């Protein structure tokens, strides 16, 4: 057994929103263990709803939990900025002893953009010293934390070696990501110059290195 | 309260086996059913496997029954899981977690009975990293500034940190010392299997060729320690 649930949702501070668990009902006669838990970054997750209408002590009454035929409902009123995290529902069933769903990360919206500042390092003489050869494309203070990097030789696109990091949100609520482009000595003082270009939201930014 | 104290990080070869400790430091622990989820990274949680100490009796998924095992130590209120033939998908940060309610009395015990009403107290998780890559230490190369001093506003300076494994490192600037502006990135797992990051400071273009910057690199798990210095 399965428990689907959306992958993402988002809502308004102030907006009320509704997470959708729709697996386990089944069994007729058999009871609902339903549950629902809340997890921040790097932190374990936190019981919310259990049983299915039932809330622990200490969590906000802002969180309800309903069920429906084969779909659960978890619904937070009022939206706050602190909500924004990442929500799995539960059951326990006869044929499967629990199921935790895929997950829903909600976004809580209105914060405004920000566009990354980009700082691109040619490789070290220490480095072509020692025959190899690696440019660092740093990517810093852009929100939210959705981007893609494209590497360029002289206007032409290049794969080969590129390592891209995901995004991940800093102490300030920005979000920072890092790109490699590995090169043999040759292939960096053959060409004319490289190019990191960071597009995030549409905006591309660029920075280039030449030897 | 309660609260529930797991064992330290752990590295792993593939086909090896790993063992996690569940220390609950408070009351609960003889009736209560102790859950096992693992998370992969950006992913969703998982269950493995459930114990009620008081029973004797355990649960698992199908999906890891036969190389997982979950055992209880009633004495010192301690929880275990080990899971055998470990491979890279098992890469994972694993919970322990206590149910919310006491287990009801089961007067004809099933050698699976599991219950669950809900996991309300969670241990701190445990990292278990499933590589088969060998300990290597890093290469460190500056990352010289683009700007020179009299081009004004900010440079930016940095250091390469190359082809490591495991994690962590540790990378300062002039012995501590140095500590705004400086972005040390989260590392990439190169085809590989080892590491590479890098850490910047953005100076300013002044202190070119005037402050003189050291980055330092700490990579315990190789014993290695580097102090490289980034010029113009
Ligand atoms: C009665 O039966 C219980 C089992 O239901 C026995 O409990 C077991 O107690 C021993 C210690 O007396 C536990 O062993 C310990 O293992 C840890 C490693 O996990 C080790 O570091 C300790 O030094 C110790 O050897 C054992 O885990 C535990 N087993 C269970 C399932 O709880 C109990 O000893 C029996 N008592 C009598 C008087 O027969």
């Known amino acids: 057994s399965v428990l689907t649930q959306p992958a993402s949702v988002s809502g308004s501070p102030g907006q009320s929103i509704t997470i959708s668990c729709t697996g386990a009902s089944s069994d007729v006669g058999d009871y609902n263990y339903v549950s629902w838990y809340q997890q921040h970054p790097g932190k374990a997750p936190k019981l919310m709803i259990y049983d299915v209408s039932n809330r622990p002590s200490g969590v906000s009454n802002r969180f309800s939990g309903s069920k429906s035929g084969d779909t659960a409902s978890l619904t937070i009123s009022g939206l706050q900025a602190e909500d924004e995290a990442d929500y799995y529902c539960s059951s326990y069933t006869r044929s499967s002893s629990v199921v935790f769903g895929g997950g829903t990360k909600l976004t809580v919206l209105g914060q405004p953009k920000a566009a990354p500042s980009v700082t691109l390092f040619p490789p070290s003489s220490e480095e072509l010293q020692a025959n190899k050869a690696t440019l660092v494309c740093l990517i810093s203070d852009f929100y939210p934390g959705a981007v893609t990097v494209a590497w360029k030789a002289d206007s032409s696109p290049v794969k080969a070696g590129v390592e891209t990091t995901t995004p991940s949100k800093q102490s300030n609520n920005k979000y920072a990501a890092s790109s490699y482009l590995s090169l043999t000595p040759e292939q960096w003082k053959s060409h004319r110059s490289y190019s990191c270009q960071v597009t995030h939201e549409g905006s591309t930014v660029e920075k280039t290195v030449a030897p | 309260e309660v609260q529930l104290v797991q064992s330290g990080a752990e590295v792993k070869k593939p086909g090896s086996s790993v063992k996690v400790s569940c220390k609950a430091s408070?009351?609960?622990?003889?009736?209560?059913?102790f859950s096992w989820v693992r998370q992969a990274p950006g992913q969703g949680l998982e269950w493995m496997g459930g114990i009620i100490p008081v029973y004797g009796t355990t649960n698992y998924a199908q999906k890891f029954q036969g190389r997982v095992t979950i055992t209880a130590d009633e004495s010192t209120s301690t929880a275990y899981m080990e899971l055998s033939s470990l491979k890279s998908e098992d890469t994972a940060v694993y919970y322990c977690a206590r149910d919310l309610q006491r287990t009801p009395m089961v007067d004809r015990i099933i050698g699976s009975y599991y219950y669950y009403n809900g996991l309300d107290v969670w241990g701190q998780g445990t990292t278990v990293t499933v590589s088969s890559a060998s300990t290597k230490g890093p290469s460190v190369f500056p990352l010289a500034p683009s700007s020179k001093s009299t081009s004004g506003g900010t440079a930016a300076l940095g250091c390469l940190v190359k082809d490591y494994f495991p994690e962590p490192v540790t990378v300062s600037w002039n012995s501590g010392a140095l500590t705004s502006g400086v972005h040390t990135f989260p590392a990439v797992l190169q085809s590989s299997g080892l590491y590479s990051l890098s850490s910047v400071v953005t100076v300013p273009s002044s202190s070119l060729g005037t402050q003189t910057y050291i980055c330092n690199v700490n990579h315990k798990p190789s014993n290695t320690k580097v102090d490289k210095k980034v010029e113009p």
């Open positions: 408070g009351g609960p622990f003889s009736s209560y059913g």
